[model samples]
Target: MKKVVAVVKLQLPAGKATPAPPVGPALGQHGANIMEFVKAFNAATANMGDAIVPVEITIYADRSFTFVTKTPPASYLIRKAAGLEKGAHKPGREKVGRITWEQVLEIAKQKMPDLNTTDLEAAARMIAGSARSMGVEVVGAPEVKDA
Candidate 1:
């Protein structure tokens, strides 16, 4: 194995990565093989539609590279679930969209593997918090009593 030279982090649209601006410049600066990365990323995320996927790439001395893809951001998923193109300008004061408790649970299941908590309720609450931060209202939020 070659020694690592650089590590780059990028968030690109799933299955839509190209050897363009971001992919090229980011890898070019580190002397990594840009085209190879673009191809690999596109293939790896081909099944994910156009959702944004975050990737971390490790570049080696030989210009070779390896990458790991992570789940989409909670905010992005929340926006999608709420059918909003973007979050509110004022998160605390302005309400933008709404999602139900069931939707929160569903989003939690998708994010559970990536989230820190093991309990579904805890995970759902995390997602709900993210939703509220984005000015998206959570309807029918579960009542959680202090333990």
Candidate 2:
């Protein structure tokens, strides 16, 4: 398996058509072909349509790479699903919203083909926890368990 690392977050520089030097320095330290990786990553995440997101770049020993852009974080996903415009002020202290156990199961089922599905509930709980951490709320606590 190739080793994957998360480089620092980079915003497309103002008026620049390509990635800036900071991106190069960060990924180049891992011996990645910065220009090629940037081009590929930008293309892949462009589907998100003008939103900046967190991305992980995996560098193989052979100097090739693969990048995965996360869909804004779990909280962001939940907020969008709930049609909310912002996150909670006190994340751990305040409750944002609720998601059903069925919905959780559905999400896990949807991700089954792409991810390990042996423990569907566990996966759901992990995803729910991510939402909680981001100050986004799930519809129900039943969708999660101590992991």
Candidate 3:
């Protein structure tokens, strides 16, 4: 095993990784090859549609690296499903979008492996909470009183 020197976490659009500001600044300081990492990442995510991808990269002391890409964030999926350009500025006071329970379940399943819980029911609830926070209403889910 290579001796790890640093761990970097980044989230960006799928299939579009570039040796730009975030990518360059994040890896350059660690002496990792930015072009190689960007090329590999873009190729790996090329088939994942337009969603954002979260990745964790480990830089070895030798300046070599390896990374694993994760599913998109719940918020990104939420926005896409709800057809919102962005979440509400004042979430609780101004609702921005709406989604159905089936959609929630779909997102939940997509995110299940990354979530902390195992139960599908519990995962759906977790996704709904994210929707609520983003001012996206769930059609068949109970609405909680604004805190």
Candidate 4:
């Protein structure tokens, strides 16, 4: 509680952790216990499977560190829902895949706590935009049909 030494936001893959570059060297560079962070992060995200979890770690002057995790990127979730490994290269001209409105709602709900808006509708709108940019169309609404 005295002084915050360093605050780092790292991109970690789900529950996987190792004494590697991003994980090991980064923490070591900050003078933190590597295993402790790895264990704690892995344990916390164990249920997340292979999904990416963006974590913000705070290292205090006392050597005590804590991390807060957020759901993976909206684009990642959109790709998953649309059953694609990647998005369209020509997003404006080509459509990649489709996902249901329900899927959008679900993803929005999962990302709600981290989004800038407090309203669920707003979050869903944001997710829909993300999906559209990735060329993933929602199942409903014919006006959004693929060209």
> Tens-digit lDDT track for model 4 on 1-147?
578776777787666665563667666745556666666667655644555766567878786676665446665557667655444465454344677677888888877777477876687766776777766678773455577
Q: Considering TM-score, which of the candidate structures 1 and 2 is the better prediction for this target?
A: 1
Indicate the residue-level lDDT of 67 in model 1. 65
TM per candidate: 0.44, 0.40, 0.44, 0.46
lDDT of each: 0.67, 0.52, 0.66, 0.65
- Against the true structure, candidate 2 reaches a TM-score of 0.40
- Tens-digit lDDT string for candidate 2 (1-147): 655454445444222325564466666755646666656655544533444455445556555556554346543345444334345464455433455555655655665666655677676765565565655456755435686
On TM-score, the stronger of 2 and 3 is 3
- Backbone clashes for every candidate come to 0, 5, 0, 0
RMSD of each: 10.2, 10.3, 10.3, 9.9
Superposed Cα deviation of residue 110, candidate 1 (Å): 2.2
Give the Å error, residue 124, model 1. 0.8
Q: Model 4: what TM-score?
A: 0.46
Where does candidate 4 stray beyond 4 Å? 29-31, 73-124, 127-147
- lDDT-sorted candidate list, best first: 1, 3, 4, 2
For residues 49-133, write the lDDT of model 1, one tens digit per residue: 5556665577787865666653366655576666454454654543346777889888887778864778777877778777777
For candidate 3, the TM-score is 0.44
